[PDB]
Amino acid sequence: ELXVDXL
Numbered sequence: 001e002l003x004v005d006x007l
């Protein structure tokens with residue numbers, strides 16, 4: 001969930 005967490 002890149003944008004949010006990174007990973």
Ligand SMILES: CCCCCCCCCCC[C@@H](O)CC=O
Pocket residue numbers: 001002005006007
């Ligand atoms: C608070 C939420 C934690 C979610 C942790 C998910 C770990 C497994 C997935 C990793 C890849 C993820 O970052 C790709 C997003 O699109």
